[PDB]
Amino acid sequence: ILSTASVLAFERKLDPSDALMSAGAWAQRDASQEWPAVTVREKSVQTVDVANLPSDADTLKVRFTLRVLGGAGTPSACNDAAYRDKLLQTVATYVNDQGFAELARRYAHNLANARFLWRNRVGAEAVEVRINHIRQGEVARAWRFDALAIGLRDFKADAELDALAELIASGLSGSGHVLLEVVAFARIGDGQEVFPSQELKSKTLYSVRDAAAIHSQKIGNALRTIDTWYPDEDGLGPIAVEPYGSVTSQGKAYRQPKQKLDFYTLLDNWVLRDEAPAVEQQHYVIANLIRGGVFGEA
Template sequence: MATKTADADLKTASVLAFERKLDPSDALFSAGRWDERDDPARWAPVPVREKSVRGTISNRLKAKDQDPAKLDAQIDKPNLQTVDVAALPADADTLKVAFTLRVLQGAGSPSACNNAAYQAKLRQTVEGYVKAHGFIELARRYAHNLANGRWLWRNRTGAEEVEVRVQHLVQGAPATTWRFDALKLSLRHFDAPGEMTETLDEVAQLIARGLSGESHVLLGVSAFVRVGAGQEVFPSQELILDRDSTKKSKTLYTVADVAGMHSQKLGNALRTIDTWHPEAATLGPIAVEPYGSVTTLGKACRQPKEKQDFYNLLDGWLLKDRVPAPEQQHFVMATLIRGGVFGDGE
């Protein structure tokens, strides 16, 4: 009876934060030739350089500006732009993208929580999930997204060949290396071809061990993308809040003058495992977000009014003992692995 009273009085902590448990580094770009993938000495960093271009007027015009004379006057004005570009050298046909990934234990354990009773109930709930499901389903999906090269984003599109290598690093040296033909793995689902199932399972088991704290897991991940000699490649683009500080129309991300990709962009790709949202049949997997946000579409796939968002599911599970369906439990745990600030503070 005391437990029921305690549960009835239980409220969400006003301070509740979780650290991310999949922690990628930034990715660095280098260039070389496809047949020299096993010779590290042959790969050179990809620089970012400026290019000045003369663009044309192509934006949608207001009605008052659609007069032929006004339009001709606009077209006659040069649209001069300075942009950053990154491209392979003329003698290199392959892009290499490499980063490291730490898999940390303590999924579901808050880094900050100011309500001891809530934290105890959260620990009990997470332990029940791990006992019932373990981390293997989530780990299998994370492994699939490593192997299929989703994290390459636009660099994967139109590539002739993509080879992904995942290494288990122990004391700085690769203990095991797995190789994948990324283009044979789908971006729409998580079913692997038969010949890759066993290899993917090995990577998934390793990630699951890292999440459960059974072992220290550091992965070295690299991809070789055969796109063609001299072709443009696509690092992350910087968000410039102060436009007056730069005259460039596009600024690309660099690490020590080497083209790179933000760790946040890599993390977004790795957690694109949510096929449990209401619009999965149409959209396929989306990144794990509390409201199922898809910024490219300008919509939230997990609306609070449908009780499918993270907060409704978590509160129902912890405060009202409404255990979600197994697939929604996976979503809640994946959101805790993602990390964030989820308190009920003002």
């Protein structure tokens, strides 16, 4: 009969860190290891928390590390043994037909364009992203991208992006340990306002140790904006991979369960009754499994 499992917990692949934002001047980004951190200072309007650059600094360096784990289809908790075997066989036939190649191409694109710079990117003058593959601590392979040449909407092929996608592919397929140190510089201007993540005196900003930062889940949600296979009206670009793939800013949920394009009905058709969907929809299902979560009833 093979009903779905009553519990499924998938662990989060693509683990990011909290994105530490520091500050400095442009054209000395190659010496940006002792840059002073952007501090969250309080000011009176009520009182709010604001975060600005220094008045002699026109570059925001956001730095975080991203760990690509691999073993995507394997759940961390599952009741039904036969369902776990069927889902592992399903993901195995997925990886056998096509590796993590389109998914890692889109993840490498979302690392390449500095989409993890959320509001610090829409008014920037020139954005440069450097991505270092760290093996044994020093470096293994250095990348450098013009994040404004690489658009947020178009996933265009590139010679270096193919290499970063192959690295994230070798990470997601479990054939190697992948740890990426992702720095990103943003010409905002002298003393312009940066936008770290916002905590819960009305507005509190996120800081780790007297240094402003974006949450790790915000960087992870910026990395997951690869879903281009939803029913696309209105000319909206890629959205973040979610079950019933929804945008809270627009207030609209695409991939509604009325249509057969949400995560849950696609996974139940693919695993239980062997109705394998299109290559794009199964890319979406495997992107959800990389995203992780609690997929199961009560």
